[PDB]
Design a protein around this ligand. Structure first.
Ligand SMILES: Nc1nc2c(CCNCC3CCCC3)c3[nH]c(NCCc4ccccc4)nc3cc2c(=O)[nH]1
Ligand SMILES: Nc1nc2c(CCNCC3CCCC3)c3[nH]c(NCCc4ccccc4)nc3cc2c(=O)[nH]1
Ligand SMILES: [Zn+2]
Ligand SMILES: [Zn+2]
Lengths: 354, 354
């Protein structure tokens, strides 16, 4: 496989399905990336069995513990955690004294790219500022412009590290809050620098689905069509469907994992809270259709018991199911786009989910 | 398979190796029984892969949540938790207003046997009193005598339930504290009633290994030779070896599970606490020889990181390793007895473990 190759196999409206080929493996798009140096309560083999092709790691948390340098000493993140497929790392740009140099908590564009190198990241995110919401036009602009200067510094840091440049990919992050002209300026800046892929940053920061969707409507077309489009931090199953309808190819969210531990299970009929007393003697699986190993073997009643009891196995089972659900959603999306029936799938999904 | 058949295949001194055959499966002895309606942080398939043939459940905890009747409604403990092999249940006699009728917390011999039935237990423990340590001779005697009266009531309750009597086994529990004459009286009483197996109760209650061993020296020979001998709540790897040298066939302990979650890993060179800084960059597996999946795939360094971070996967990995260690210990014991070299194994084990 090449360092990076994105190929679109089929389209329906703005939606696309295809593959990203990288040295450590192939990524099917639209893709959901479970978030980790562990995907909480799952062994990597379990993550893989659910259908994930790539997972996310984090510059900020890993740099604190166990340390970037320590992980490199030990062989890199892949060997450390036992996941041999691609890993995307965020830059630390979401998760203090700020300056043009970077942020003291030190993290700058250069340090962020170095940490991702030390971790052995396959997909490296530029170091950005995730603009708070709401933001005035002035502040959104100032923040966006800084991020574009940091995007150039990120590019140059990545490129000056031969091993990194030859084996990893670099994504740029569009900012601009909810303002069309700032999103356009940002897209233009990023395309001028040139990246392997383009994220839509600064959303899922409290604006609400309708606003998020309105911003995606004009922002995604601004990005290079022939490169992947990554919506950072999204989201609920319905957010995902609507975002793919607007041209997004990649997603990460802590919801399936976090939710899972707190008792929320995703189903095709909508989310359920398994701790509710109504499930205490319910012998059916979490979801009627789900092909995951949890739904093949255990009942709602048992998982209800486990979560109310605080048992670790409850977290394990809920998290495996939810990540499997998300991957099954992505597979249905991929298949429906490839077959030219995604708009019908989206409508069907929504009518049942809601 | 029959309801219950114990066969001794080989002996060395007081040590024995063989099999217990029951309807849900075969149990290799000497046996270690992991303790659970979950073996903490492990799926049942994982428990089975470590080599366990039987696991333990608990009358007391299950009767509180989710309830005995509720579990029966749902199909019994085996279907509920997804473990289809034998299950031994304790009576609640270790774990309030006491009277000859039973104990109010209500639990009596009759209720205890009924709860174990409702759970679908394969090996049912008589309802007893675990005599506090230290105990004077008077109190130990009074307590032992009550337990023997409760043993008869347990026998009669079990026998009056046809389904239970035809499909499950019943073990009696010897008491008498540390006093030889009370242990003999108790053994005699239990043999007169007649059970499928005989536990040594009232040990591992703070007396210390030397005293425990001295009591086993005279107490185990008092029990029927042709029936299994179960030492309740023991213990550390070295307790297990010494107890098998004294005629014990079955063991349960929460140590491998509890220890695992708290950072203590068992190794052939003795226990280690994985949180110690010395393991932070140690790429070796938990144990050099261990065949478990954890030692095949992850380093001390990674598990160190996980446990210090409070990650669930750390508990999962530590617990799988420790239960695998215990099963490998049992296999080495079984093999060494069958080959007539257990005394040498015991000495070798101790010299390296300590
Ligand atoms: N560099 C960068 N990162 C962003 C992130 C983090 C994406 N997940 C990273 C993982 C790395 C490890 C942790 C996260 C975002 N996450 C969200 N929404 C999350 C909202 C949410 C919160 C809790 C639950 C569900 C959703 N918006 C984000 C915007 C940006 C952004 O502009 N720039
Ligand atoms: N009916 C009965 N049960 C006893 C138990 C419980 C055995 N494990 C049951 C499982 C069912 C679910 C929970 C336990 C005992 N456990 C111990 N020692 C444990 C000491 C220990 C404590 C903590 C960690 C390691 C060892 N002595 C015991 C004596 C008796 C006894 O006479 N009668
Ligand atoms: Zn499922
Ligand atoms: Zn191991």
């Amino acid at each position: 496989r090449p360092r990076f190759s994105f190929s679109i196999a089929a389209r329906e409206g703005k939606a696309r399905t295809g593959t990203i080929e990288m040295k450590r493996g192939v990524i099917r798009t639209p893709a959901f990336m479970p978030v980790g140096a562990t995907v909480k309560a799952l062994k990597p083999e379990t993550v893989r069995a659910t259908g994930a092709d790539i997972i996310l790691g984090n510059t900020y948390h890993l740099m604190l513990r166990p340390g970037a340098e320590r992980i490199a000493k030990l062989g890199g993140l892949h060997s450390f955690m036992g996941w041999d497929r691609p890993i995307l790392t965020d830059s630390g740009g979401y998760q203090t004294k700020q300056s043009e140099e970077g942020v003291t908590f030190m993290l700058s564009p250069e340090r962020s790219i170095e940490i991702q190198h030390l971790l052995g990241s396959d997909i490296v995110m530029a170091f950005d500022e995730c603009t708070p919401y709401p933001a005035t036009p002035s502040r959104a602009a100032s923040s966006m412009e800084r991020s574009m200067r940091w995007a150039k510094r990120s590019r140059d840091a990545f490129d000056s590290r031969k091993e990194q440049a030859e084996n990893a990919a670099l994504f740029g992050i569009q900012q601009g809050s909810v303002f069309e002209n700032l999103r356009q300026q940002s897209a233009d800046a990023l395309a001028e620098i040139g990246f392997d892929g383009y994220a839509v940053g600064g959303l899922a920061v409290g604006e609400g689905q309708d606003e998020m969707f309105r911003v995606l409507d004009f922002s995604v077309p601004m990005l290079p069509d022939d490169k992947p489009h990554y919506l950072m931090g999204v989201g609920k199953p319905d957010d995902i469907v609507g975002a793919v309808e607007r041209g997004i190819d990649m997603f990460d969210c802590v919801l399936p994992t976090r939710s899972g531990r707190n008792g929320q299970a995703f189903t095709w009929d909508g989310p359920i809270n398994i701790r509710n007393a109504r499930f205490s003697e319910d012998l059916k699986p979490l979801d009627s259709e789900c092909h995951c190993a949890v739904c093949q073997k255990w009942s709602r009643a048992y998982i209800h018991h486990l979560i109310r009891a605080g048992e670790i196995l409850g977290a394990m089972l809920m998290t495996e199911h939810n990540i499997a659900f998300y991957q099954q959603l992505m597979q249905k999306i991929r298949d429906s786009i490839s077959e030219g029936r995604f708009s019908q799938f989206a409508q069907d999904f929504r009518a049942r989910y809601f």
